[PDB]
């Protein structure tokens, strides 16, 4: 079995799913590496533990990555299926290191079972889970069978079986509903209504939401690629347009002709416009179309940015009624409700279209 | 009277307060300069017009600043009361230029009557109005009397009297309530509840709100200065802690000893911590007290920043129930309702206190 199994009290203290209020100290990761055949024996199994504070370098997911890099050198270059049972959901830094690892090595596939979710006072925690999902990691809450499997495979049970605790199924249900909500797919209607708006009073909105879709040129028709379809938002300290650029390479598009469409609630500031100019200049097989609900004055060179983005290709347009309705129909968890326009939508669209046409062309 | 009066049709289309949906073109500013004596005759009166797009250098508030700078060199060095009737509220750039002019020149006081509010798709429009108010500008909605006075003093009416339009009062009332809301002074309760919270799930909250109060040391008792008391929030492209430092010189504090207290919904990132350390090093008569609702991990050197701030003086502490309740009582438009704690408030306070005590100190 295992070289040094987990102590039953450690398991009971850490692999549990009832809500608690204490801060984190140590997190545990039970890890199993298998071949491509699910009924093959496990190639290896190891337990990792790490202190949450004060450095993420020592979190068990980082220890796993460093371990796995040396461990894989000692076998043939083959496909691996890795499974983690982890007592708490990973931190943002580790979510990003794992997503990058998965993206750079397609021969590894990862399934992550978490006992409980932790959020780390991170305003961008949701986007960390979403980046893991985009890099191919499967993430589920541990249910009865997984707790019992981790008990059998990793705990020094001394013949004793997994004894469940009271309300285990109920905590599972609540956590899994929470996880599914964090991994949505379709945007919340209140989110759409708070952000995709063009009234000149913007209700103090500093967030930028971005709905994206990709089409491929195939026998001279544009065919949708619905597996690359969704929405994102800005991060604390990283603008939404930059996160969109960071998302694109996870799609691993080939050299065919692609058309990427973004509906963004704010047009790009100058710096994000310049990064988008660089991206489209280095990826000319990719046609970029940006529709903005509002024009963002970054108190600087945003007009130069919009003109530079327009000149390097890229269609830039203000959203009209039709684009708003399309975004609602296509990206919103609307449950059959129709689009509901707000007063002045068409007039503000017309005024903003004029301002944009004036920015392009010239006068400033 | 005046050398160039406004044409009645110009007044009718621009000095009106009914809601409209069109974009802005030209804005009008009727200006009257008087001495400190209300019963003195007006020394001068001038009309300015400016195109809103594409450069704020030509907005009428800027033309007024350039004109007035030359005008006052040619008149007596005395105190002046300036009155503006302006067809729309100023843009951010003009609001800040006027605030700076007012702050650097105490012998001039400005009253601004606006026919209608315009928001320019600016997420920080509220702060522009608020910085105008903190520099001493009085800002009111034009009522019947102000429309009538503007008509008499500035319009080529050819003996005709001011004729009001239908719903002048009702639009006035709606507009003045909106303006009063923009200059609040006391924080809306929903704002407080959405931002001053310490659950480790932060609801993606990227805003930082900051409540401040000032004390004076007088014969070794700490006296409040309730004229320097309020709240602010971050801007697009400028963090809340920087906005607070920018605010402090508007207070024109002398060389006595002052204690400034911040209750912030996020502890400062590294760059803001360093700017605050610079501030307290250049203003040793000002003792700084920071209470944070949550610790903000800026994905960089934020722990060094908190340590530097703590080493340079400056008390850094996490908010407990007592501080939350004090902020509710002191800064919130609570209308007599008591503070309502949320679940886990005390436990999350204790966990964050532990983390902060570990960050100060050391361990990594
Ligand atoms: Zn981590
Ligand atoms: Zn940007
Ligand atoms: Zn202006
Ligand atoms: Zn900061």
Among residues B242, B294, B238, the alpha carbon closest in space to that of B273 is found at: B242
Sequence ranges of the domains in chain A: 8-183, 189-359
The residue assigned the tokens 């495979």 is A153
Rounded to whole angstroms, the Cα distance separating B112 from A258 reads 54
Ligand 1 (ion): which residues have CB within 5 A?
Answer: A 56, 59, 91, 94
Instruction: Name, in order, each residue with C-beta under 8 angstroms of B151's C-beta and a sequence gap of 6 or more.
Output: B11, B15, B157, B161, B162
Nearest CA of chain A to the CA of B97: how many Å?
Answer: 14
Helix axes A168-182, A144-154, angle to 10 degrees: 100
Q: Are A103 and A249 in contact (CB under 8 A)?
A: yes
Are the beta carbons of A162 and A147 closer than 8 angstroms?
A: yes
Backbone angles phi, psi at B95, to 5 degrees: -60, -40
Distances (CA, A) of B334 to A236, B243, B329, B340, B341: 30, 25, 7, 11, 14
CA pair distance A141, A144, nearest whole angstrom: 10
- Enumerate the residues of chain A whose CB falls inside 8 A of the CB of residue B22: 347, 351
**Angle between the A125-134 and A240-247 helix axes, to the nearest 10 degrees?**
20
**Does the beta-carbon distance from A53 to B363 stay under 8 Å?**
yes
Residue B64: partners with Cβ closer than 8 Å, 6 or more residues away: B29, B31, B46, B48, B84
What is the A31 CA–ligand 1 centroid distance (Å)? Answer: 16
User: Which SS3 state, helix, strand or coil, does residue B77 take?
Assistant: coil
> Residue B205: which of A123, A237, A355 has the nearest Cβ?
A123
Q: Do A8-183 and A189-359 have matching folds?
A: yes
Alpha carbons B7 and B151: distance in angstroms, whole number: 10
Q: Which CATH class is domain B189-359?
A: alpha beta
What is the CA B253 to chain-centroid distance, rounded? Answer: 18
Helices (H), A135-248: 144-154, 168-182, 189-195, 240-247
On whether the CB atoms of residues B265 and B322 are closer than 8 A, the answer is no
Q: Give, as one character, the DSSP assignment of residue A2.
A: -
Q: Is the CB of residue B40 less than 8 Å from the CB of residue B59?
A: no
What determination technique applies here?
X-ray
Q: What share of chain B is helix, strand, coil (3-state, %, to 5)?
A: 40, 25, 40
Test B347 with A201 for CB contact under 8 angstroms: no
Residues in chain B closer than 8 A to A358 (CB atoms): 53-54
DSSP conformation class of A205: -
Distance CA B354, CA A92 (A): 21
Resolution of this PDB entry, in A?
2.5
Rounded to whole angstroms, the maximal C-alpha distance in chain B is: 82
Number of H helices, E strands in chain A: 12, 11
Q: How far is CA B5 from its chain centroid? A: 34
Backbone φ, ψ for residue A125 (5° rounding): -65, -45
Q: Which of B118, B124, B354 shows the shortest C-beta gap to A23?
A: B354
**Subunit contact B122:A344, Cβ cutoff 8 A:** no
Would you state the structure tokens that stand for residue B217, as one six-digit string? 């040391």
Gap between the terminal Cα atoms of chain B: 76
Q: How far is CA B41 from CA B34, B37, B38, B45, B159, in A?
A: 7, 9, 8, 11, 21
Helix (H, G, I), strand (E, B) or coil at B352: helix
Concatenated DSSP letters of B172-231: HHHHHHHHHHHT-SSB-HHHHHHHS---S--TT----EEEEEEEEEETTEEEEEEEEEEE
Which option is the CATH number for B8-183: 3.40.50.720, 1.10.1040.10, 3.30.830.10, 3.40.140.10?
3.40.140.10
- CB-defined contacts A:B, below 8 A: 104
- Look at residues B54, B65, B57, B125 and name the one whose alpha carbon lies nearest to residue B89: B125
Residue A70 burial (CB < 10 Å; 0-12/13-18/19+)?
exposed
């Amino acid at each position: 079995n295992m070289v040094e199994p987990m102590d039953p009290r450690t398991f009971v203290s850490n692999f549990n799913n009832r809500p608690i209020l204490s801060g984190l100290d140590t997190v545990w990761l039970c890890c199993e590496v298998k071949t491509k055949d699910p009924s093959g024996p496990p190639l290896d199994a190891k337990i990792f533990q790490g202190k949450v504070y004060p450095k993420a370098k020592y979190h068990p997911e980082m220890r796993f990555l460093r371990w796995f890099h040396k461990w894989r050198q000692l076998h043939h270059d083959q496909e691996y299926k890795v499974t983690w049972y982890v007592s708490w959901s990973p931190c943002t830094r580790c979510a990003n290191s794992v997503a990058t690892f998965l993206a750079k090595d397609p021969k590894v596939t990862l399934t992550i079972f978490v006992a409980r979710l932790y959020y780390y006072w991170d305003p961008d925690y949701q986007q960390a889970l979403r980046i893991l999902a985009e890099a191919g990691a499967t993430m589920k809450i541990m249910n009865y069978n997984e707790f019992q499997d981790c008990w059998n495979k990793f705990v020094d049970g001394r013949g004793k079986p997994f004894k469940p605790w009271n309300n285990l199924p109920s905590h599972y249900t609540s956590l899994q509903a929470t996880l599914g909500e964090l991994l949505r797919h379709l945007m919340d209607p209140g989110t759409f209504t708070s952000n995709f708006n063009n009234k000149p009073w913007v209700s103090g909105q500093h967030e930028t939401y971005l709905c994206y879709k990709v089409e491929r040129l195939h026998n001279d028709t544009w065919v949708p690629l619905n597996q690359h379809r969704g929405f994102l938002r800005n991060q604390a300290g990283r603008h939404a347009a930059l996160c969109f650029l960071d998302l694109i390479p996870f799609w691993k598009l080939d050299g065919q002709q692609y058309r990427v469409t973004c509906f963004t609630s704010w047009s790009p500031c100058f710096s994000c416009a310049q990064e988008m100019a660089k991206f489209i200049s280095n990826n000319e097989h990719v046609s970029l179309c940006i529709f903005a609900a509002r024009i963002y004055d970054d108190q600087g060179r945003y007009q130069e940015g919009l003109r530079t983005l327009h000149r390097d290709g890229a269609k830039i347009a203000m959203m009209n009624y039709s684009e708003f309705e399309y975004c609602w129909d296509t990206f919103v968890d609307r449950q059959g409700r129709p689009f509901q326009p707000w007063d002045g939508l068409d007039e503000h669209s017309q005024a903003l279209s004029g301002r944009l046409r004036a920015i392009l062309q010239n006068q400033g």
